[PDB]
Amino acid sequence: GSHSKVFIRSAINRVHQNSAANGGELPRIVFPEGTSTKVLKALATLVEEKICQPILLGYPERVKEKIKALDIPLLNDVSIVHPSSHPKYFSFVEKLYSLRQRKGINLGEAERLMADPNYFAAMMVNQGEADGMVSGSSINYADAVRPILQTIGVYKEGIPAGLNFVLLEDKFLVLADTTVNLNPTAEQCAQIALQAAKIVEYFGIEPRVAMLSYSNFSGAEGTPRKMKKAAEIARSLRPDLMIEGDMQADTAVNPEIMERLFPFSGLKGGANVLVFPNLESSNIAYKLIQQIGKAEVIGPFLTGVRRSANVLQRTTTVDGIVNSVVFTALEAQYIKEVLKS
Amino acid sequence: SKVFIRSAINRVHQNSAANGGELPRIVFPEGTSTKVLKALATLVEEKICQPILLGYPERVKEKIKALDIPLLNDVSIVHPSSHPKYFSFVEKLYSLRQRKGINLGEAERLMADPNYFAAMMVNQGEADGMVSGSSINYADAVRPILQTIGVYKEGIPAGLNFVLLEDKFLVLADTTVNLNPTAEQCAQIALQAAKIVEYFGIEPRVAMLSYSNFSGAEGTPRKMKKAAEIARSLRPDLMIEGDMQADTAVNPEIMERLFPFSGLKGGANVLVFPNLESSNIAYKLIQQIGKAEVIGPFLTGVRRSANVLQRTTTVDGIVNSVVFTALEAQYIKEVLKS
Amino acid sequence: SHSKVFIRSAINRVHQNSAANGGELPRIVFPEGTSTKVLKALATLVEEKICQPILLGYPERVKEKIKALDIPLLNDVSIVHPSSHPKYFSFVEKLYSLRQRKGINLGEAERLMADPNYFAAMMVNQGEADGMVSGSSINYADAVRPILQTIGVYKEGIPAGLNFVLLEDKFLVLADTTVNLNPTAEQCAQIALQAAKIVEYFGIEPRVAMLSYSNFSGAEGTPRKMKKAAEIARSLRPDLMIEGDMQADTAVNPEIMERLFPFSGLKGGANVLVFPNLESSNIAYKLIQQIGKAEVIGPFLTGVRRSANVLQRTTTVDGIVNSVVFTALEAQYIKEVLKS
Amino acid sequence: SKVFIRSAINRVHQNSAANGGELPRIVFPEGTSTKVLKALATLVEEKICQPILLGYPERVKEKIKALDIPLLNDVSIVHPSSHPKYFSFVEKLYSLRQRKGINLGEAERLMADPNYFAAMMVNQGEADGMVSGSSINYADAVRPILQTIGVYKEGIPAGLNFVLLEDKFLVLADTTVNLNPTAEQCAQIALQAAKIVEYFGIEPRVAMLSYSNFSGAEGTPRKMKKAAEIARSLRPDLMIEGDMQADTAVNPEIMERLFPFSGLKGGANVLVFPNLESSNIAYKLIQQIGKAEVIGPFLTGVRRSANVLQRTTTVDGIVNSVVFTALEAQYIKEVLKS
Amino acid sequence: SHSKVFIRSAINRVHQNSAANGGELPRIVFPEGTSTKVLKALATLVEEKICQPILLGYPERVKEKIKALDIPLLNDVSIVHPSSHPKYFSFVEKLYSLRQRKGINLGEAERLMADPNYFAAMMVNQGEADGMVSGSSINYADAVRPILQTIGVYKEGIPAGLNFVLLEDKFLVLADTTVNLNPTAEQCAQIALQAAKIVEYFGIEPRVAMLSYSNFSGAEGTPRKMKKAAEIARSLRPDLMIEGDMQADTAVNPEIMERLFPFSGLKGGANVLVFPNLESSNIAYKLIQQIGKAEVIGPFLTGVRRSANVLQRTTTVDGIVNSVVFTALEAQYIKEVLKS
Amino acid sequence: SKVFIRSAINRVHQNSAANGGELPRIVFPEGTSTKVLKALATLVEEKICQPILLGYPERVKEKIKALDIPLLNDVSIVHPSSHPKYFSFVEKLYSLRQRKGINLGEAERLMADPNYFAAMMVNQGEADGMVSGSSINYADAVRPILQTIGVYKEGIPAGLNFVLLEDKFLVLADTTVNLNPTAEQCAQIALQAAKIVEYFGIEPRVAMLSYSNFSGAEGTPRKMKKAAEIARSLRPDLMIEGDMQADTAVNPEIMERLFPFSGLKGGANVLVFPNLESSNIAYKLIQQIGKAEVIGPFLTGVRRSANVLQRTTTVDGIVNSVVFTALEAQYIKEVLKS
């Protein structure tokens, strides 16, 4: 809908200007599930929009049958690759073996693993054969994110964490971590908050962070103390930022409540970054907002990884996949423009 | 949206009419709270309850004059220390809590507090229900209720909110009390939620929520799965399922496409949460971001009608709460017919 | 002198029990046969008709030290050397049968039965003796260990040390002052019950308080534990006054009790104080002993199937006679209930 | 036994004259307690302190005339909410606990409690000390003191009792506050008790109590041994020994006969306990069946002089306690000019 | 050697079982239809009429590698590719039914069933084959998992790996050497029973030792666990000699047993060794294999409803043959239990 | 096989010849044991040590002269209670354990027990070594040794066995002492074993054993990987690898085929076990079913040479044990010239 339509549009244009400012180059983005119906319709929409050069994984023949089966003339010159047959396959196996030979994985096992398109996608982005990847529209979340974590890994002091946008009529809220960590520590919560914060900063918005709890500034043993400590750590790391907690969710989003009941709070003007204390709360919240709050909700997107990779959920729509790939492109460009410095 | 409240108001009238026209006596510890009083104006125009206010009679009349609402004069006003049943109440609280760290002086001082006094009023039949906690935090407001009124058999104190959608309403629990309920506690919460939904002539369809879809893995997935099983064994006629993600629960299309083995068909109308972080955070986020109205929380599992507001409540929230307290009070009066 | 009046009544009951049982005196074996102090005690008691003592050690060594402190009334006393007693191998055989699956081999067992403590124990267990008194030479844990291993507890019983505080008219009973680090609610109830039976033996109504640092709070930890212990004790003997959790001054002082906690079922001051942990019991009884004017006797071991007592390593000679007296009484009481 | 009390009283007079004849202001939240007023009768006639009574002015004047006590007709009596610094006091408390669950309404209503008000008065220098808790249980009374006045640096709040023997005096700690103190905490307590004993020109000799004589075994014995080692390393001039049984500690003859290696000769005069059950049971049993008079408990480790009585306290117990509260207030004021 | 005799006996007993069952051979499926070692094994196995092998993979790849390794006797052998088989979707539906509440949806079930291990498993489960051998190609946990998810355990049974140590005279059986990290007393008892029932099949008296670092100590930890395990085992099978806790030399050397522990119900030396945890069983069998002169066969999977074994990938061709032999033998046993 | 043992004997002869003809003094607490006396019979004709027997002098001559031997009347015999340095020994033991539950009488009684006496003989330089425990179980026998002689700096008591093959020898540890050694502790055991292996002129190659090959998974895999890393960081000159299975550790062909990245080439000759079950069961199983002779256990990590047998030992085992005990005694005596 409407708010979603303007948001994505600004993003599509920035990928246009970032490609137009690096010689017109498009980010190379690999899709392990080359035969997915949903993914292919999405790519159809995506290629006329000049955002990425897609790379598809699977048997060349089987996917060409399925794209023709799905009536799409705009998608025939795109690279299609079967991992075992790619020329860089064995260097990739040796690399994975090198990475996990002391983590229960032997050489044969590395070969078997690298044959799975997820691992191959990850190794492609990791070795620079692709700029980014989108995976997991058919497999469950944990299993899809695992190769990304083993192969691409996190940036220094970073923590893998899923992030969603709920798009309101002027502003947007960001929610994390919605997919990865069961029960993040105070330290992990602070880090999750900082990652969410940089994402908000990309969009030119001042980040205002709340560490969520079932309590309003109580600091009692358990989740309240944990979110209070998390805000204290985040603040020690970024003294320029409005970061506050522990607080209830309405206290966080509604500044009128804040200023009336807790005026001492350093969080003024309503939070636009919401950090959850555990996975039950984040997962349940973003999904409920999506289904009954009737507010537009995009994501989840993966934060904390060194190269751009995002895993879809199985319930994702086709335009949802387009959103995900757009942001994968933006992230890839962001990273490559940051590695030039 | 407005339809639901107005309907309930009609039911208060229909029940009161079927009982000789008396309205449920509802006590308010916060007698000088602005919100409680003007909301009370709006509800008192509607013949929903006979309000009893606690405080100094004179401070309450001064602040009644201050908010220019003549329509609630002549309503009963009581100062706890000066009520004739005061010493008897103190004696009661004492016998209840003398082996729980409380001496007679402590009992006296506690019964002077409007919350304890209200609680005891409801417990002794001096009132039918109470609405408190627009000024103090939930734990502190709910505590005298748990100590005085208590739970019914095998019951569990649990907060429940309604999400009122376009045709449907969803019920959410436990949104206020239990930090990390067990499987067993979750089943009980489900059962309580279910009875509430049944009151409204709707068949309960229950979801035990998790971050997972039917995995049964160690931790929350297994706990909510086991909860579903326990609920089914205590009441086999019910549509109760889990572990499942929230969208899987509320969206029948997702259910039908991705998990057709599920004994839950048609979208859930009861969502039981795995812990207080998720339940509290969710209902408050929905109330603030979704168009849908959220009423509550209402305290389930207690022997008499008692409800704690959230401190962040608007006045419409308070009139809504008082309405559903009234209904609850007459439902209870009707279950006490046995 | 409360100690002398108190012991004197006891001595009269051992005398009363010995009559009507053919005039027979309980046989009590003493593992430290070469100890100066034990012998000093035996001198005083053979003059008092309380038991027929059996001493363990080498006959030559024992007559040596009996000759050294000039005591003629204990010549003609039963003296036994463990390896040379005739039932020795039958004994080693039973200990072996008892502990073959609890780390003990036949040789190890052999050497253990050679230890005076284990043999004294096995003697009482096989009915070749009626009671024992041990550990005037060895440490407490180390002395009680063979007793628990050979003699054991009676049904539902729990090993527990008990002291008497003798005041100007009544006495207080304190337990458990020696054995259990951190008794559960259940165990505290059993401790209470055993103490109570002792008090009942003296014709006094037992009045039991489960001690805590709290007055009826039932809060998490020891308060809830002692409240629950009293509820258990009350369920097991509903005729008895048993109450808790409460503070010690609340416990012993009835005026304090009635002024502050009239709902309490304990009226008249406690005469049995059951403690929540070993620190409280041990420290209390020893302090009462050292700064309190009042005399404190014990500790005596309760809960065992046959009459056994462990002394302290620091114990005096009168400590040994009152200990042996109580041991005789215990042996007689048991033999008389085993009568139908 | 009363000899010790007289020595203390005379010192109160001596310090009082060395500061212009000025008396320590000590506030008593229980302004209407018969016990406190009778004890204050004895104290004002003894020139030990300037009393501050908390409550409604007229009700306590009513009860001082009602209980026939003419020597405190003119004493300062204060009702908290009507005090001129009431709102600034609410602001400091609010500021202190806004992130520990307390909102401004809760701050106001708390500051109304005489306990909280006594503590804030001493905190802000409006009074020099306070004695409370003859009517409420210990935890509830000591809490505002810990929240408002707090501990001094590296300090640990702990109750200390004096055993007055016919000869020496013994000190017992921690007799009221901490359930199961660690080695480090036991050491700290030993040092605080030690400084108290030094105040009286006495060499403190410290014993860490246990059920064991120098075993150091897993549990309480190791803890009391390690606590003695810690104490010895933190203050090498003091005789501090453990683990040991109590009779070993107080009887020097047993010490020389059985453990001549101990660095403690001459019998202990500072007894530090392994847990709250042992300290509480012990001092109370000694007080009730022991022939020695026991005073306290006194709270150590706090920045300003504040002491909580025991509920079982006698009136002579209160006069004793307040005498030593005065001495403490003076020591604290004389060290604060540095 | 010892291996050659034992294997010949197993083979002759497979032949003896094929009689009275119509000359029918156990149907055994090999998901790794293209494994060199397995095909090499299958030559030897089919000349010996041990099983009717079913190969999984592409018909053309497997016939190509059959031709490439010159084995003429495996042309016409059943070869099935999971995806093109007629009961494929029915198999997917069954797996979906088994794991829909354990995190697997219909699509995940489809993909899993596409894997030869899962398809093999489901064949055994559905009676379209009698047994399976996998994992000469993948590491152990991954290979054993589909078997447990599809085939499962029998009543009160436990997945457990078992090895034979073949000596110059006797054989010892070792378990559990592959699956369970730290089995309980109860689980150890079950493991012992499974090892025993196997020993019984060969007409041998099972004599079982619960191994520990201790001799009949029953102390906290693994000693108490192995003694308790032995007690549970005895209570379920009183005709059997089962003893513990004991040290290994005590267990296998009857002269030691009789000299130091005559009370022990284990006389004549153990031939079943049940280990307290996976470190000890796994390290034990590998050290025996590598430094003793003793031959070691296995591991074999016990506790499963139908006949399935996983090789280790480090397996030799003769190893695959042993595995298939004992798998066939097991299959026949199980079919003999379905005879009432 | 026999060659390794004869080589040890040949070296004890070489040091015994090269330091003036001195034979290492070795004490035996069980002076009346048949097994020990038969071993002593084989050993005294081999000039490896000066034996001292413990028990009643006349009783040990009763059983030794009586059963098959003419070469044992020339031997040292000691009854603890009658030895001239007895009371001095109890005095040092008292000093060592006075704060560990043992008082002077208990010190006397322990020192009358031959095990404590033997250890104290070695500790005071009055003897060079001891061999004990064919009559008592292992723990009870090793305790006086640990309480008296103790560990060297950063050392940890650990039993070590040799498996003797036709070319190599392997060491297995810790086979006797620690239930579930930590990563740090395992590294330490590795280091002590490596030191013994260097002594025999072989380069140590250490493998940390697991049920897994380089998985590093939660539990034992991670523990042994971590142990190998710590050990390498303390001794970078050593080949140390893990976590790995036993065939992977001992068989170098397996290593190069399956795990070519490993820093361990040539097969491990030092095997460190993850727990007491695996170590004890392993060495006993190899001992009973493999052709190979297994000697030990020998107690490592302790300051002076002391060793405990298991009863399951044969006489030839006692022969071997006393042999490396004498040799050990000579090595430690050579560190004592510094």
Author numbering:
A (entry chain D): 436 to 776
B (entry chain C), D (entry chain J), F (entry chain L): 439 to 776
C (entry chain I), E (entry chain K): 437 to 776
Original paper wording:
The larger ME isoforms (hybrid enzymes) are predicted to be a fusion of two unrelated enzymes; a catalytic N-terminal ME subunit and a C-terminal phosphotransacetylase (PTA) domain.
PTAapo retains the same D3 symmetry as the acetyl CoA bound form, and, in agreement with our HPLC data, there was a clear lack of ligand electron density. Loss of ligand binding results in locally small changes; however, the use of d2 as a stator and d1 as a flexor means that these small alterations are magnified at the isologous d1:d1 interface. When superimposing the two states via d2, it is apparent that acetyl-CoA attracts the 3′ loop, pulling d1 and d2 closer together.
